[PDB]
């Protein structure tokens, strides 16, 4: 009969690619809450 | 309005250390906030989006760190983004901040979208710094002018039918999508109700069914709830920030919910890391987290 419609399901990668990280050099005074 | 020299200015402090402050003129934000303005209602207050794309958490005005996420995940135009809110208060530079996501949408307004979160309403920015901050680099004048801009935010993402995507969460009011589209704009954020809901509420491990939240303000939801709503609704995943987490991402109910937060050592008063989730073409999800190199 009648064709479904494409679906896309959300899916996580294999556990080793699931996190990629990115480094940045800590400066302690960069964040603050004005506050 | 001359879009590329404002983003010119605004990317040129990239790699400063000290980090400096972007000074735009007053006129030049105040056309950011008109010309963003009229894009957002023209476009629908639920958005309806396609993978892929990149979504982000809460930034609270370290302008700095967005750089980082934009310098990692790859500048507008070269990736697509889903920004969930609370780009204002607590930090530095909420107003190189906005302005700068303000730029990206009014440049790329296709493939470049901006959810509101709790902190872009007025009686919420006035206390927590960017009232201060508009008042001490120009004026009040300028900080009513967002606050007009941020009234007319759209206040839901849904990603190729399936990743239903808001700042806080569910609400017990929220049967219908139709409910959502149905809110007018410009509109301030209600002390209690749908609007409220969407912007404030958190999950939580301990409840059942909705419980009550200590921001004193909305409502906290459980794992059931959240199945509840995804099978009732087509969707596969509840996408959200709202929350610092260690990680920069968390789940929760199994993977049926995830919430982001991308300002890393948040307000230097947080050892968090901060993430972005990458969603491909096939809605396969991913995280980009940025950490301290120590
Ligand atoms: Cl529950
Ligand atoms: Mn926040
Ligand atoms: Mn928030």
Redesign the pocket.
């Known amino acids: 009969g009648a064709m479904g419609r494409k679906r896309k399901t959300v899916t996580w990668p294999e556990e080793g690619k699931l996190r990629e990280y990115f480094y940045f050099e800590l400066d302690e005074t960069e964040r603050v809450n004005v506050n | 309005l001359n879009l590329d020299s404002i983003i010119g200015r605004l990317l040129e402090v990239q790699g400063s250390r000290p980090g400096k402050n972007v000074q735009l003129t007053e006129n030049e934000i105040r056309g950011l906030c008109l010309k963003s303005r009229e894009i957002f209602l023209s476009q629908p207050i639920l958005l309806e989006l396609e993978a892929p794309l990149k979504i982000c958490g809460?930034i609270?005005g370290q302008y700095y760190d967005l750089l980082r996420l934009f310098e990692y995940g790859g500048f507008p135009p070269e990736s697509n983004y889903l920004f969930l809110?609370?780009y204002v208060?607590?930090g530095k530079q909420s107003l190189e901040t906005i302005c700068l996501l303000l730029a990206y949408k009014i440049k790329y307004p296709e493939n470049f979208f901006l959810l509101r979160?709790?902190?872009e309403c007025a009686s919420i920015n006035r206390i927590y710094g960017f009232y201060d901050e508009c008042k001490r680099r120009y004026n009040i004048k300028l900080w009513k002018t967002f606050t007009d801009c941020f009234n007319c935010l759209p206040i839901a993402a849904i990603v190729d039918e399936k990743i239903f995507c808001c700042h806080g969460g569910l609400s017990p009011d929220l049967q219908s999508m139709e409910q959502i589209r149905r809110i007018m704009r410009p509109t301030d954020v209600p002390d209690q109700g749908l609007l409220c809901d969407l912007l404030w509420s958190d999950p939580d491990k301990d409840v059942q069914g909705w419980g009550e939240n200590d921001r004193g303000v909305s409502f906290t939801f459980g794992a059931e709830v959240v199945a509840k709503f995804l099978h009732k609704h087509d969707l596969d995943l509840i996408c959200r920030?709202?929350?610092?987490v260690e990680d920069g991402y968390e789940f929760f109910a199994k993977r049926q919910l995830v919430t982001l937060?991308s300002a890393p050592n948040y307000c230097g008063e947080f050892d968090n890391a901060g993430a972005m989730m990458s969603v491909d073409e096939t809605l396969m999800c991913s995280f980009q987290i940025l950490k301290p190199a120590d």
């Not at chain 2, 920030?241 to 610092?244: D, E, G, K, W």
């Open positions: 809460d609270h809110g609370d208060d607590r979160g709790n902190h920030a709202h929350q610092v937060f």
